[PDB]
Amino acid sequence: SKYEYTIXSYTFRGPGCPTVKPXVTIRCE
Q1: Which residues are 11's β-sheet partners?
Q2: Is 16 helix (H, G, I), strand (E, B) or coil?
Q3: How far apart are CA 12 and CA 27, in angstroms?
Q4: Cβ distance 23 to 14 under 8 Å?
Q5: Hey, where are the domains in the chain?
Q6: 9 Rama sector, left if φ>0, alpha if ψ -120 to 50, beta otherwise
Q7: Cβ within 8 Å of residue 28, ≥6 positions away
């Protein structure tokens, strides 16, 4: 499991799958 949580124009991709606030939308691969 790896979270890709995208903020603005920057894709932040690493380990641990949490849930996110309105605006940011995570992907657990």
Answers
A1: 6
A2: coil
A3: 11
A4: no
A5: 1-29
A6: alpha
A7: 1, 2, 3, 17
